[PDB]
Structure 1
Amino acid sequence: VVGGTEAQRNSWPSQISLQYRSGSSWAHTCGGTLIRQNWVMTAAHCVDRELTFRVVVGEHNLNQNNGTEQYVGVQKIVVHPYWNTDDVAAGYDIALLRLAQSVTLNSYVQLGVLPRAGTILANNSPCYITGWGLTRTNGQLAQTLQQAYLPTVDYAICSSSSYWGSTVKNSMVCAGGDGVRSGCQGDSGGPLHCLVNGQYAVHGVTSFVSRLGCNVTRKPTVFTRVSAYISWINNVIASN
């Protein structure tokens, strides 16, 4: 997250860190949202590589013992069947991870609530992106979980020619684009939390930013629209 602030450690208890085994250690690669005690929602592109993955719930500082973490292996990966890794702009950038164990819930570990199917946010709706992604274009991962306020940019604007044009689909949510605050590499797969009727819900799964940089004016961060995938999510969980 570029232009973020440090999150309070109990603000976003559904945020997870998706990590891969790297030598004798683990490296953060993506975010995700805990949606059942044994299921995480993330981006398909985060699990394109044939790596050994684990999820960390209750994580705050990637570089220090928080006293709250639970570490759990990924047992099964179900990518959306229409995902095509060389065409992110087509959409379908979503995957579910079944965890090897069911995590224990507490103030640091909660299920993300999802929007009702079909919900589309009005332009300029208030949301936060959260994650440990790069803090500058071509920078480094954050140590502590970051948040940035990114108001939505509706389809009509986001798919206009000075924004994303044809690359943004109605199955996506755009947020931000102010040139200061954005998602960045390593935030992929994590949540966009939007406040609706008094309650934050996870409306987005971080999918892409501009090849020209993270915080680029009129290139808002692009997310998979969770509300387009409610039936898919339920179908996967019920069949696994």
Structure 2
Amino acid sequence: VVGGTEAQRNSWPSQISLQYRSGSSWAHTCGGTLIRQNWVMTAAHCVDRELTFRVVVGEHNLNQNNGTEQYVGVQKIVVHPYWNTDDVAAGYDIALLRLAQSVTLNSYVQLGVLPRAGTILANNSPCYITGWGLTRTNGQLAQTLQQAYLPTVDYAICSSSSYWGSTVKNSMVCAGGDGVRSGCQGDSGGPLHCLVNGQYAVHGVTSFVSRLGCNVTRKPTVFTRVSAYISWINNVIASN
């Protein structure tokens, strides 16, 4: 997250860290949202490589023991069947991870509330991106979880020629684009939390930023629109 602030450690209890095995240790690669005690929602592009993955829930600082973490292996990976690694702009950048063990819920570990199917936010709706992604374009991951206020940019504006044009689809949510705050590499997969009727709900799964950089004016961070995939998510959890 570029231009973020450090989140309080119990603000976003559904945020998870998706990590891969690297030698004798583990490395953060993406975020995710805990949606059941044994299921995580993340981006399909985060699980494209043939790596060994684990999920960390109750995480705040990646480089320090917080005394709240729970570590669980990924038992099954279900990518949307229409995802294509050669075309992130086509959409379908979503995947569900079945955890080997069910995690225990507490003030640091909670299920993410998902919007009702079909819900579209009005332009400029209040949202926060959260993650441990780079803190600057071509920078380094954050140690502590970060958050940034990214108001939505509706489809009409976001798919206009000066923004993302035809690259953005109506199955996506755009947010931000101010040139200062944005998602960045390593935030992908994680949540876009938006305040609706008093309650924050996870409306987006971080998917991409401009190839020019993370915080680029008129290139808002782009997310998979969760509310387009409610039936798909329910169908996967029910058949697995």
What TM-score do you get using the length of structure 2 for normalisation? 1.00
**Structure 1 CA distance for aligned equivalents of residues 85 and 20 of structure 2:** 19
Q: Deviations over 1:176-200 (max 9, x none)?
A: 0000000000000000000000000
Query: What is residue 44 of structure 1 aligned with on the other side?
Result: 44
Query: What is residue 165 of structure 1 aligned with on the other side?
Result: 165
Alignment gaps of 5+ in structure 2: none
Q: How far 1:60 moved relative to its partner?
A: 0.0
Q: How far 1:95 moved relative to its partner?
A: 0.1
SS of the aligned residue for 2:214 comes to coil
SS of the aligned residue for 2:235 comes to helix
Q: Deviations over 1:139-183 (max 9, x none)?
A: 000000000000000000000000000000000000000000000
**Structure 1 CA distance for aligned equivalents of residues 144 and 98 of structure 2:** 26
Aligned-pair RMSD on alpha carbons? 0.1
Query: What is residue 93 of structure 2 aligned with on the other side?
Result: 93
**Structure 2 CA distance for aligned equivalents of residues 75 and 141 of structure 1:** 26
**Structure 2 CA distance for aligned equivalents of residues 62 and 21 of structure 1:** 14
**Structure 2 CA distance for aligned equivalents of residues 31 and 125 of structure 1:** 22
2:186 is aligned with 1:186: yes
Q: How far 1:116 moved relative to its partner?
A: 0.2
**Structure 1 CA distance for aligned equivalents of residues 34 and 20 of structure 2:** 17
Alignment gaps of 5+ in structure 1: none
The sequence identity of aligned pairs, in percent, is 100
Q: How far 1:58 moved relative to its partner?
A: 0.1
**Structure 2 CA distance for aligned equivalents of residues 214 and 88 of structure 1:** 16
**Structure 1 CA distance for aligned equivalents of residues 180 and 155 of structure 2:** 21
SS of the aligned residue for 1:41 comes to strand
**Structure 2 CA distance for aligned equivalents of residues 122 and 31 of structure 1:** 25
Q: How far 1:71 moved relative to its partner?
A: 0.1
SS of the aligned residue for 2:200 comes to strand
SS of the aligned residue for 1:233 comes to helix
Q: Deviations over 1:3-56 (max 9, x none)?
A: 000000000000000000000000000000000000000000000000000000
What TM-score do you get using the length of structure 1 for normalisation? 1.00
Q: How far 1:222 moved relative to its partner?
A: 0.0
Structure 1 segments of 4+ aligned residues over 4 angstroms from their partners: none
Q: How many residues align?
A: 240
